[PDB]
């Protein structure tokens, strides 16, 4: 907000990157393994 937009400044871009990283980690926590990388297909992820 201070920078006026995610794409307005380098710091804004990196802040938005971290923000979306944390949001996705919270959203996809069930699909994220502690150490190993979790792999899924459409049928596993219910994609039509």
């Amino acid at each position: 907000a201070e920078e006026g937009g995610e794409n307005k400044s380098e710091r804004a871009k990196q802040a938005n990157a971290l923000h979306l990283l944390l949001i996705g980690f919270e959203q996809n926590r069930e699909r994220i393994n502690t150490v190993q990388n979790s792999t899924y297909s459409m049928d596993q992820l219910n994609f039509s």
Binding site: T39, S41, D43, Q44
Partner: protein, 49 residues
Amino acid sequence: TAFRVSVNGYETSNENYVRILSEWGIPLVDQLIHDSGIESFRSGIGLYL
């Protein structure tokens, strides 16, 4: 060989095995054993004795 096995990454190892041997059958197992080469060692030691 004449087999055209295909491993699916979206399947479990056990189910992939089930599918492969269901499609191909015992000839694949015979080729696998030949690759193992137990028969060669057995026959060689038997001939020696």
